[PDB]
Amino acid sequence: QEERERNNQNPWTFERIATANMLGIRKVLSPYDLTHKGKYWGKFYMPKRV
Amino acid sequence: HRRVMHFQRQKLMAVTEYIPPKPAIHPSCLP
Amino acid sequence: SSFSRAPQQWATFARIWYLLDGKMQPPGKLAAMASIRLQGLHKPVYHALSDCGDHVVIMNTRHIAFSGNKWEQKVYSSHTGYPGGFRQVTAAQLHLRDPVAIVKLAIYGMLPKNLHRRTMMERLHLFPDEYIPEDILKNLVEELPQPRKIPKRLDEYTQEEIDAFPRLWTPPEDYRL
Amino acid sequence: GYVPKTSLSSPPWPEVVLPDPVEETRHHAEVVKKVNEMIVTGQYGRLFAVVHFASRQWKVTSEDLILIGNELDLACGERIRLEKVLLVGADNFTLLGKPLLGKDLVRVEATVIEKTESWPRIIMRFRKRKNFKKKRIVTTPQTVLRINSIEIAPCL
Amino acid sequence: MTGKELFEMWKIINPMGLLVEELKKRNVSAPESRLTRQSGGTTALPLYFVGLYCDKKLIAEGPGETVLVAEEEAARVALRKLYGFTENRRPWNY
Amino acid sequence: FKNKTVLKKRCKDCYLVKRRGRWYVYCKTHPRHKQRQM
Amino acid sequence: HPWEPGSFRVGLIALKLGMMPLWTKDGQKHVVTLLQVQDCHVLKYTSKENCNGKMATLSVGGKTVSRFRKATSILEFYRELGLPPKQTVKIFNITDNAAIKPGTPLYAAHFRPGQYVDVTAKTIGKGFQGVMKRWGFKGQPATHGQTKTHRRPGAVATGDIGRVWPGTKMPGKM
Amino acid sequence: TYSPLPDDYNCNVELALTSDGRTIVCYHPSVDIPYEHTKPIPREEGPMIEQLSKMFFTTKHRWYPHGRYHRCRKNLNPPKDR
Amino acid sequence: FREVVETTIIEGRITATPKESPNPPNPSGQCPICRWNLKHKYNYDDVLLLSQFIRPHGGMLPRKITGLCQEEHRKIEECVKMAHRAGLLPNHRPRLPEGVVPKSKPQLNRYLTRWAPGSVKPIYKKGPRWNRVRMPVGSPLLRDNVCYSRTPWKLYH
RNA sequence: CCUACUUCACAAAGCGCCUUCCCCCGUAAAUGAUAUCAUCUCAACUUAGUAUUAUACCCACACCCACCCAAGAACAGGGUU
Ligand SMILES: [Mg+2]
Ligand SMILES: [Mg+2]
Ligand SMILES: [Mg+2]
Ligand SMILES: [Mg+2]
Ligand SMILES: [Zn+2]
């Protein structure tokens, strides 16, 4: 998971956009999403998301 | 089955997907 | 230029007879071409109210080809008004029943959904085989290029072409093959 | 880096070789010169020009009428030169500018023949169940121009 | 005169006759009529283009609903070109 | 045959073939072991 | 030509005289219909290519009628034949080897005992009939209420469809 | 040796630039049809609608009349251009 | 190549075994195709390439014999299946017994056929727009192929 | 459909008589590669397998006085030698 985070070729991450409020995205995001970094959605957890 | 997301949220999820690195030549093809 | 008004008008809005060969061609690509010509969209003088559509003749509609498993998968659905009148047949079944049906239906689908459509269908002429009526043959002007380039069979390749392509691997001498 | 001839070995589009700049420059000179010579001699017949006037591109010829949707602050019968010619074409040659042809090259002349109001145009607003209904009548000032002449001078 | 065809102003009968007389006046070969282009021959709405050739050189091409009408049209085109009443003729200088 | 979402070979003589676009377990020794992918 | 397997011969046009009983040696009684063949002639032959059909056709006419009551077209056709006009003309699909020259008379001995035949006619017209006589609908009971419902069609269609299906059994001409 | 478009149907297009590079010059003389490319000149309402439909490759609908309302609506003196 | 001959005596005889072209453009290539820079540059159409890796009766040759890359073996396998179904290999017909003469069957021209025609069931009930049952065209194994057009291969129709 | 029987009687009916034609597909097997055995094959393929069923019916058009009718609400249809 750590390796995938470091290895990622995508310039845009959920964390980066969410923290900076890049498209006014905090409007459609939970305050919890800042900490969850888009990995967690409700009770469900995505292991495949960086 | 998951809860329906806002379209803007879903778009963000789609944009922020892990892209694995691709070498110029496949490692198997290399000696 | 320098024509009289009536012959000028006549030349501009004249109907043109085109020929298409349907041999080893997808119906949809033929339909795409036919639809363009039937509506008159190929003509730069085009307008909906100008009825400037052109005649399209398609031959070898029996010898059409489908990509994938569309002969089996694609289903044509029709309902006679009566209860239990719903009939579903595969593309293969319809083709055996009526050779011109698939190309006809494809073109009909791609035509605009208005009152002009059916008149445009009158300009369409479909023939299953090589044979075309003599009157229709006399009308023809241009043969449109086939939308799909047919791949050559192995036997169709010349000796020159075979020798041009390299051997990629060396088989063992003691192998049965 | 050789690849044996297959379907996907080579791009489907044919190989295109463009002429060498030196030869092409020479060729361009010859073409320009003969077109210039035609202009000198007067081989051309009727000319058509694409003119930019009042926000719109007008394909005009001699003795052509155009309707301009504004007042031009010109007395009727006044001859004006339309600048901003994009394209000037004959039977056998066309000259098109980047984006405008030079003043020396082409001259198009028109005259004001008519200054009129447009026919009344109705503006109507209605929203159901809101008691919302408005009516306005507008007439737009208009000018009619007669394109008198298009002339070309040998400047290439 | 503006915006008018020559033969709209000057009514003519048998333009082919006029053409042959004019060409023999200029000491060239009599024109040869050939079908340049054709569409929907058997139909109720055919288009025919016929061309006139003098020593295998094109002088005029004319469209018509029939071959005979096309011939007449080609002849009129020829006469227009000879007399200099082409549509694309230099406009009148005022 | 019995329909199974997951196919298991029940003995050694069981064998797994794709026929008619779906997986099957066939067994000549024990015919009861026959299974069809659902 | 001699008969071959797959070949079909022409039929006849007969007049329905009536019925009488017939007995068999086993003792069973069978009712039979009498069909009289009256002035049955072959009228026209059409080839398969000309007919634009699968088989060659013979038009055969029966039961001579008045010349005065026929149209000019029909009269002209019969004049060319040299036969008086016939009430009905029916078309028989035949093979090429079964072709017969027009004008040739046809007789009852064309058929032979032990052979099976198909008979086609217009049925007796009962005019406009209700559902009970037309489709054998059960109808509604006589008493125990039933104000105005004795012979009526019940529910014609279903509630959900806001219409009546094509080919529903309704009162009409039978 | 290079042509952007095949010059055999409409006209022979030659593209050039003026020395300054401000004006694009196009020379397009018309292409004339050769002699060789040419060819020598040779020497009952119901049924009626069907005949007309076939003759002009139309549907039957066109050939049916319309009522007085539509006939009288039509402009018998329409504006003419050119 | 070895031929077995039965005349009862059975012998094995070696005929002319064809050999690789003298100089490959990319030496130190692991695959046979990797060597000739033909990784993503062949389709079902390319019968010259495909005929090299098949038995006379149409069957695929084993990976070890040909020394193909596993990935490329799978690609060639499915390409040859498509080639057969498209009718591009008429000389590699199955070994039919002399007695058995194939009955006349209706002919349908096809190409880019992934599945065996017998196995596929008709799509009687295609879904709504949002969940549509689509007809597969071409193999996903050929997804990595070089794409000259801007639009990628539409794998599902 | 009306010869009998029965309700009845120039006829309509059943309680009476006559006629009534093709298949379905889930699997069961050969040969045979990937995976030199084997393997019914979302391998190329071979049979049960039948595929598009097909054939039947209908099909010429006076006067549209009048009369008749086994045709019919009207209209239309059949007959009037
Ligand atoms: Mg009762
Ligand atoms: Mg009562
Ligand atoms: Mg009451
Ligand atoms: Mg009558
Ligand atoms: Zn077992």
Swiss-Prot record, chain B:
This is Large ribosomal subunit protein uL10m. Component of the mitochondrial large ribosomal subunit (mt-LSU). Mature mammalian 55S mitochondrial ribosomes consist of a small (28S) and a large (39S) subunit. The 28S small subunit contains a 12S ribosomal RNA (12S mt-rRNA) and 30 different proteins. The 39S large subunit contains a 16S rRNA (16S mt-rRNA), a copy of mitochondrial valine transfer RNA (mt-tRNA(Val)), which plays an integral structural role, and 52 different proteins. uL10m contributes a single cysteine residue to a zinc-binding site with mL66. Belongs to the universal ribosomal protein uL10 family. It comes from Homo sapiens (Human). It comes from the Eukaryota. It is found in: Mitochondrion.
UniProtKB/Swiss-Prot annotation, chain D:
Keywords: Mitochondrion, Ribonucleoprotein, Ribosomal protein, Transit peptide. Disulfide bonds: none annotated. It is found in: Mitochondrion. One of its GO terms (biological process) is mitochondrial translation. Belongs to the bacterial ribosomal protein bL21 family. Component of the mitochondrial large ribosomal subunit (mt-LSU). Mature mammalian 55S mitochondrial ribosomes consist of a small (28S) and a large (39S) subunit. The 28S small subunit contains a 12S ribosomal RNA (12S mt-rRNA) and 30 different proteins. The 39S large subunit contains a 16S rRNA (16S mt-rRNA), a copy of mitochondrial valine transfer RNA (mt-tRNA(Val)), which plays an integral structural role, and 52 different proteins. This is Large ribosomal subunit protein bL21m. It comes from Homo sapiens. The lineage of its organism: Eukaryota, Metazoa, Chordata, Craniata, Vertebrata. The gene is MRPL21. The chain holds residues 49 to 204 of 205 of the full protein.
From Swiss-Prot, chain E:
Its main location: mitochondrion. Residues 14-84 form the DRBM domain. GO terms for molecular function: double-stranded RNA binding; endonuclease activity; RNA binding. It is found in: Mitochondrion. GO terms for biological process: mitochondrial translation; mitochondrial translational elongation; RNA processing. The chain holds residues 223 to 316 of 332 of the full protein. GO terms for cellular component: mitochondrial inner membrane; mitochondrial large ribosomal subunit; mitochondrion; nuclear body; nucleoplasm; nucleus; plasma membrane. Keywords: Disease variant, Endonuclease, Hydrolase, Mitochondrion, Nuclease, Primary mitochondrial disease, Ribonucleoprotein, Ribosomal protein, RNA-binding, Transit peptide. The gene is MRPL44. This is Large ribosomal subunit protein mL44. It comes from the Eukaryota. Component of the mitochondrial large ribosomal subunit (mt-LSU). Mature mammalian 55S mitochondrial ribosomes consist of a small (28S) and a large (39S) subunit. The 28S small subunit contains a 12S ribosomal RNA (12S mt-rRNA) and 30 different proteins. The 39S large subunit contains a 16S rRNA (16S mt-rRNA), a copy of mitochondrial valine transfer RNA (mt-tRNA(Val)), which plays an integral structural role, and 52 different proteins. Component of the 39S subunit of mitochondrial ribosome. May have a function in the assembly/stability of nascent mitochondrial polypeptides exiting the ribosome. Belongs to the ribonuclease III family. Mitochondrion-specific ribosomal protein mL44 subfamily. It comes from Homo sapiens.
From Swiss-Prot, chain F:
It is found in: Mitochondrion. Component of the mitochondrial large ribosomal subunit (mt-LSU). Mature mammalian 55S mitochondrial ribosomes consist of a small (28S) and a large (39S) subunit. The 28S small subunit contains a 12S ribosomal RNA (12S mt-rRNA) and 30 different proteins. The 39S large subunit contains a 16S rRNA (16S mt-rRNA), a copy of mitochondrial valine transfer RNA (mt-tRNA(Val)), which plays an integral structural role, and 52 different proteins. bL36m has a zinc binding site. Belongs to the bacterial ribosomal protein bL36 family. This is Large ribosomal subunit protein bL36m. The gene is MRPL36. The chain holds residues 66 to 103 of 103 of the full protein.
